[PDB]
Design a protein around this ligand. Structure first.
Ligand SMILES: Cc1cc2nc3c(=O)[nH]c(=O)nc-3n(C[C@H](O)[C@H](O)[C@H](O)COP(=O)(O)OP(=O)(O)OC[C@H]3O[C@@H](n4cnc5c(N)ncnc54)[C@H](O)[C@@H]3O)c2cc1C
Ligand SMILES: [Cl-]
Length: 635
């Protein structure tokens, strides 16, 4: 009987197939001839965009050890070409067919296919991805439409991409909204560029959940009164977060849009704009669009007449060309029968770590957990190690399964509390999830084993990417020592991130929120760095039109739109004048002082005013008081 059958081969399955091949475990892959969304986008010439996630978090460790030389955002073409390279390596292991049904029994499953052939396997892994309505819409979009109005009832990374393609042709965008969370995908730290995933230092949650909450949440929840942040200039961007009940922040179930702020876009791309646009680097700065009025936010109950295609706002009956509403993704699962009889109903909270459904036996799910920030690779690489160990080590399979229902209950109590289930439950902070899996497998690090300040920087501030856990032990990858060294040298050993936590250790949440927004450029949604890029935006629109071979008449003044913008931006016009120029920027000065201190004691042993108080905090990091995670235990 077949030891392992993997159903679906795209991107998520690659690291699991690698480990099964290494241990020479018997496996077979079954994957559809139709392919993936990337295949159909490639065939229609629509891989003309870029990822919302950094290279280090979006490609697997065994590629990074060869190819990493700098932080950057890959293109969609680069991502798909990597899928195809690995498909070519493993194609001899792939049967091209479509699984229609799985009958699950006590220790094996019977797999049915559209061709009529059946397969038996002890262990079955599903890696089939999601269906998304927005995908078809992206695949049929005519990007030459010009001088029209669009109404959106949803906002998300796919809607933000469509908006980026519409803005250059003088199209006007109305968002009927109940709020959204958007975050600059690259920020400045003392002028230097960092991708947002580098700033999260997740293991500081072990110091205390309250400290970590202060470190992370002021850009998401409306905690600062600073008139420069977008959620004070445009209050309709604020979401209702009354559902949150967990003390673990950012909460499981929070989602965010990641976008290019125009200042960092200028820094990277101004010298070769037409080529960068043609490669897929599109300016998608939703904060710049709100600043300029090219997008307006209106209340969710603003009335729409769908027969006449009008929306009524500011006393104006505004005609619109197209209405856009996204849909809920759903996992692409075949029929699955419990004990060969009872249809299985998929529920994220009823699985362990999104991988092990407790209602089935020896069936595992790979690729159905989504990261809050960064790429899917971090998640699926760790899931693959977890699945590989469950399949190949019976003692580990038993250790996890013997108390599986108790582990799931404990996980849900920790991360969701009494909150009712939500459709976005499957989204997790990536550096909590990777560390959780590492502790379950046993490839984690121990804070008490740090000897020097440099060791503490690696433990707490070096990002919890999957490759962090593949230097030593069971799942070691050749070349990770050099990769970690290069990343450390290019980021000053993450001292600047380490010092953030040091700086807010004694603040309450209001003080920490004010401190976060006291920088000359704070990380997220800083509306002081938009007006100065108006001339560049004109240059960008011209470049975009040249690449798409479009001529756009922008001579006609749309006074009606200008009136609607004025109504929509009343709060901005009252709040923005309160922005004050400052002589000193507390956060910039505090971080600069902290970096100098840390780099000066980098190689000091831990056992050997501000400096004294900082050294005391550092010594306490060897014995963090909030390390317990009850769902890791075997009891
Ligand atoms: C527009 C878009 C942009 C994205 N951008 C990013 C980004 O910037 N960063 C990031 O990290 N992720 C991004 N993703 C998410 C993610 O990386 C992709 O969704 C990725 O394709 C998921 O890989 P997968 O292997 O899980 O699924 P897929 O790539 O969809 O592969 C699954 C395969 O299984 C096959 N299959 C399905 N059902 C069956 C069956 N019953 N029998 C046999 N075969 C079957 C399918 O035909 C397919 O070939 C994006 C996704 C989309 C749609
Ligand atoms: Cl990177």
């Amino acid at each position: 009987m077949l030891e392992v059958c993997i159903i679906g081969f795209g991107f998520s399955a690659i690291p699991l197939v690698r480990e099964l091949a290494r241990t020479q475990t018997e496996f077979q892959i079954i994957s559809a001839e139709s392919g993936s969304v990337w295949d159909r986008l490639s065939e229609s010439g629509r891989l003309d965009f870029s990822l919302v996630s950094s290279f280090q978090t979006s490609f697997y460790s065994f590629d990074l050890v060869r190819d990493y030389e700098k932080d950057y955002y890959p293109t969609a073409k680069q991502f798909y070409e990597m899928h195809e390279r690995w498909r070519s390596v493993y194609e001899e292991k792939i049967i091209r067919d479509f699984v229609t049904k799985i009958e699950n029994f006590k220790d094996y499953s019977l797999i049915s296919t559209r061709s009529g052939k059946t397969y038996e396997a002890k262990h079955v892994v599903l890696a089939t991805g999601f269906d998304r309505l927005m995908n078809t819409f992206l695949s049929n979009f005519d990007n030459h439409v010009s001088n029209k109005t669009f109404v959106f009832d949803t906002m998300g990374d796919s809607a933000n991409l469509l908006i980026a393609k519409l803005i250059p042709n003088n199209n006007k965008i109305i968002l009927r909204t109940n709020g959204f969370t958007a975050l600059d995908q690259e920020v400045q730290v003392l002028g230097k560029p960092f991708t947002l995933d580098q700033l999260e230092s997740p293991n500081f949650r072990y110091v205390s959940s309250e400290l970590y909450d202060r470190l992370m949440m002021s850009p998401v929840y409306p905690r600062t009164v600073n008139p420069a942040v977008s959620y004070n200039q445009f209050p309709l961007i604020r979401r209702d977060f009354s559902w949150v009940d967990s003390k673990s922040s950012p909460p499981n179930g929070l989602i965010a849009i990641k976008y290019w702020p125009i200042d960092q876009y200028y820094y990277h791309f101004n010298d070769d704009l037409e080529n960068y646009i043609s490669k897929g680097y599109l300016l998608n700065d939703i904060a710049m669009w709100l600043h300029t009025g090219k997008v307006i936010l209106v209340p969710s109950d603003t009335p729409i007449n769908f027969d006449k295609k009008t929306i009524t706002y500011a006393g104006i009956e505004r005609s619109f060309h197209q209405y856009v509403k996204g849909d809920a993704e759903q996992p692409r699962l075949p029929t699955i029968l419990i004990n060969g009889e009872t249809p299985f109903e998929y529920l994220y909270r009823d699985t362990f770590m999104g991988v092990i459904p407790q209602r089935l036996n020896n069936i595992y799910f790979l690729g159905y957990t989504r990261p809050f920030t960064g790429g899917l690779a971090n998640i699926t690489e760790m899931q693959s190690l977890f699945i590989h160990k469950l399949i190949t080590q019976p003692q580990f399979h038993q250790k996890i399964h013997q108390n599986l229902s108790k582990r799931i209950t404990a996980y849900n109590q920790h991360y969701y509390g009494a909150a009712k289930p939500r459709k976005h439950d499957h989204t997790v902070p990536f550096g909590f999830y990777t560390e959780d899996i590492a502790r379950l497998i046993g490839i984690h690090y121990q804070p008490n084993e740090c000897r020097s300040v440099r060791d503490l920087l690696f433990y707490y501030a070096f990002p919890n990417n999957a490759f962090k856990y593949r230097l030593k032990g069971e799942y070691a990858v050749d070349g990770v020592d050099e990769l970690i060294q290069k990343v450390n040298d290019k980021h000053d050993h993450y001292a600047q991130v380490f010092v953030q936590a040091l700086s807010i250790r004694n603040m309450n949440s209001d003080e920490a929120a004010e401190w976060d927004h006291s920088a000359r450029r704070f990380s997220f949604n800083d509306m002081r760095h938009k007006e100065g890029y108006r001339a560049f935006l004109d240059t960008y629109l011209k470049a975009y039109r040249q690449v798409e071979n479009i001529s756009v008449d922008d001579t006609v003044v749309d006074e009606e739109w200008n009136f609607m913008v004025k109504e929509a931006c009343q709060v901005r016009d009252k709040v923005a004048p309160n922005i004050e120029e400052k002589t000193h920027y507390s956060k910039d000065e505090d971080v600069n002082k902290g970096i100098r201190l840390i780099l000066s004691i980098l190689d000091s042993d831990i056992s050997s005013k501000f400096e004294a108080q900082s050294i005391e905090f550092i010594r306490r990091l060897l014995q963090p008081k909030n390390y317990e995670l009850l769902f890791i235990r075997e009891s």
